[PDB]
Subunit: 261 residues, 4 copies
């Protein structure tokens, strides 16, 4: 679909599952040279790699924890070592867990902030460092959430991490725009993934979330991979520092449908 | 580029020049059927129509003033009469003129609000009316501007029209998302078009504008038509109620570059 | 409470009822010289004036339709004629009516846009014109709504009017900030007023709206008058171009409480 | 000025200097009981404490590093132990340092995120924990910045910390609004404080900053403490989850003045 993506090197953190996996497969289909990432489970990457082989794509799997500076540095270097360059950096790794704010431990708060936000900073910093030092107009895509805008009770750490990612991305975008380096966020709504498999398999919980989505359905990973592929391409040549929400309308305030209030 | 766009009927207001023209050609290239629009004489639309023919596209030009209800209604009916249906409605017609707010006439204010906002309303209304009465999962793309967010002294009417268009679009998107009818805005930054041809002709004014664009260059119409094609496609299937900015970073506050403030 | 408001001339459009009335009474209590406004019913102003007399305040009632340029011009002049000056201009007049967007007539759309948005522009233009021509650091407060941000199905015209008012205010604020003229919006959530009396008297409808308000209760006009009084005072000396939401949390997405989604 | 503030217990982090100091004095003037905070030595807090004594206010100074959980907990307990309760918790402590993003160390990034965001979290958490376990309708005011919205090259960590603070606050406000616990942010623009004393000392840098402020002048701490007093008062009873900007117009995009672009 996107011809300019051919031969482009794409690194995606936490890409052995969910959205990250869907993005690695989509990029492989666009003839991009993908670098899949797994925290510790090298077995999880096997599946994505097989899917990538199935479409005649090229990719390697690199172990790396986004909260570990050396792992992030090594992840970017691995891409350059294997493919000779880096074009797109996608900070997709993330985690969440429901706890009432006044009962949330520092440990829980720090883990989410560290992975979701600090992890994205490290990945962004490394990709941009390479782009600057070698005069490459590469791009950085950060996997945010509708929650960088929609507050999230029980998930204050996640909301904060994403709200912070928003400003980080915008700052990075304004800072490196003169060098032609684009930095954007993708803001997914509810998307059928492993972290949601059990919750959404239950008709009661599935219907509840669906009632919060104006378009009436829970998105598929393909719908988000489509956003990333487009944002990375030259089609989005004049697009930077934005958050492209792919959420079925969640950010439109579903409680206000039918003229309520 | 987008296979799903083939055979789709796209109506674009004020598409004889600038962004509208570019989108009309881009949709022609996507093998879609296009209904171009001109305000006064059909001579104005022949350039676009010849461009569409050149790429093997199918199209017609229909006269219409977007502030005239019957004209807007006729425009939608003409598409349906000529191509049998309607899939994408793009409210692109617009106008602006600088005047200090406290000295701005009601006449000037009204001309801008009527065309930019009310005009967009009528077009969205007619297209959505058709989509609902026929349960068609159509889409409405409204051409906004960075000024639906960035205030604009001397263009208080333009800014308010786009700010109003933002809420109109969000409302329409929430109201019709249950029917799969997506409504999105595109927010262009400074784009080289006939309305800027003279201003950007003076290298001193072009340089002033470029200094407000983080990416350092005034955009080209193709960079916007790229956004319109994607938004209309099924690639943006889960995207509704958003404003996708393509401004090379304008909304990022250019005056705060290099840690200023 | 606010000492600098003593002797300040405050004009409030549509102040014979609801929030406007509460603001006129509050300003009178702050020893401000208030100019109440009624569209045609001079009898409605009687009540506000009596309430103003009850607190030992000073005020006059002026007839004026905000969609009529001459009425607006005359309203501002009346303040200067009676009290010798103008310090604060509050564009509070407004209207709404529920109609599905694809079924909304141009007449309905125009009436709401004309009163809510164009009416605010005229009032803002006149107040600012006076402020500029006489070197006065006066202020303009525009009565917006949570709907300048929250989409509103069935009320597309209202949402659009308020979204437009947001950009108008911001533009006016940036434009006249060099002259020390502040322009801000107040964004009320659900507030017990005449337009809501019948709807909220019904326990079922009252409970529905209350379920959309995080703080659990429908606000009182006094809670909004408190916002206006503060914004007009020198306490808000460094505040301009903002929208101060007084909504019990509506803009925080009530559908997302308890970690839903 | 605000009668309801008399006898209220206000805790303010990093209140020995700047904005924190000003708010502490302002709350003293409002006849409230204040708990001032200093990081290293109590010598630093004596200026504030003497200022509070001067106006007849009651107060104590409590040592505490906001990134140390036990210190934050002790700070809340000390207020409750000294004045019997807690009514207002103000997370003011903050820090920043310029470094190009791609060259920013994890250490620098962490120091800023930990103090600005995590520190604010701990304070909000402890205050809210107390408010919930005692069903007290307390309030939390978090000191953000225009940079929770305005991107800031060279301060990617600061910007992300405030962006994260915005979502944290919104989440906390939605989560606890049912209990009448209001949580709001204050977004100061450029304010003359010790962190800017040296930079604004050079008339060339002061002029550069002033040129980015629509209102033309760098704010004073009192202009911010004014906002804090109001937000804490019952005058803002229906205000929660907002960020009240006091920046003389910075968020209005100063580069777009006079119709530029
Ligand atoms: N699934 C959704 O509906 C949804 C909605 C909005 C945003 N998101 C965001 O999209 C991204 C993808 O989410 P997902 O649904 O696929 O979730 P996921 O949990 O399936 O994917 C996240 C991946 O990150 C990996 N990971 C976590 N911590 C890591 C670390 N320290 N180092 C390396 N890898 C690490 C995990 O092992 C996992 O495979 C996340 O950032 C998430 O917050 C998802
Ligand atoms: N050019 C830019 O840099 C830029 C930046 C942001 C937004 N926009 C927006 O994009 C759209 C396209 O702008 P453009 O640059 O091509 O401007 P344009 O003026 O060249 O295009 C608008 C077209 O609308 C037509 N038109 C105006 N009023 C009309 C009416 N009442 N009925 C019918 N046709 C009418 C005009 O004749 C014109 O051809 C507009 O909505 C504009 O506000 C443009
Ligand atoms: N009541 C709420 O809950 C709420 C919430 C958000 C925003 N608002 C806004 O606050 C303002 C006050 O609303 P309210 O609840 O008091 O409603 P209201 O209808 O009681 O007050 C509006 C007043 O405007 C007057 N008016 C209408 N059109 C006019 C015109 N053309 N010329 C002169 N006067 C005119 C009306 O006669 C009326 O007294 C409105 O702008 C409204 O949109 C109200
Ligand atoms: N000064 C401005 O122009 C301005 C503009 C926007 C926002 N702000 C914000 O307002 C707040 C006040 O800023 P300020 O200008 O007075 O800055 P400041 O640095 O003078 O005040 C912050 C105080 O926090 C203390 N502090 C820092 N880290 C701490 C820690 N870990 N534990 C305890 N105390 C700690 C510092 O010693 C200092 O006295 C900050 O949150 C700042 O980011 C200030």
């Amino acid at each position: 679909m996107y011809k300019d993506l051919e031969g482009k090197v794409v690194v995606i953190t936490g890409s052995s599952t969910g959205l990250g996996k869907s993005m690695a497969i989509r990029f492989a289909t666009e003839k991009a040279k993908v670098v899949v990432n797994y925290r510790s489970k090298e077995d999880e990457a096997n599946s994505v790699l097989e899917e990538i082989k199935k479409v005649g794509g090229e990719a390697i799997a690199v172990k790396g924890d986004v909260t570990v500076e050396s792992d992030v540095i090594n992840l970017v270097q691995s891409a350059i070592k294997e493919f000779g360059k880096l074009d797109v950096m996608i900070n997709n790794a993330g985690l969440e867990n429901p706890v009432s704010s006044h009962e949330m431990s520092l440990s829980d708060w720090n883990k989410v902030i560290d992975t979701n936000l600090t992890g994205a900073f490290l990945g962004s910093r490394e990709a941009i460092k390479y782009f600057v030092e070698n005069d490459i107009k590469g791009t950085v895509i950060n996997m945010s959430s509708v929650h960088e805008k929609i507050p999230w009770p029980l998930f204050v750490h996640y909301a904060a991490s994403k709200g912070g990612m928003k400003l980080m991305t915008k700052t990075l975008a304004l800072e490196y725009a003169p060098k032609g380096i684009r930095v954007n966020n993708i803001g997914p709504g509810a998307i059928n993934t492993p972290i949601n498999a059990e919750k959404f398999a239950d008709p009661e919980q599935r219907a509840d979330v669906e009632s919060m989505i104006p378009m009436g359905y829970i998105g598929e990973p393909e719908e988000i991979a489509a956003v990333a592929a487009w944002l990375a391409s030259s089609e989005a040549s004049y697009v930077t520092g934005i958050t492209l929400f792919a959420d079925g309308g969640m950010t439109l305030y579903p409680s206000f449908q039918a003229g309520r209030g």
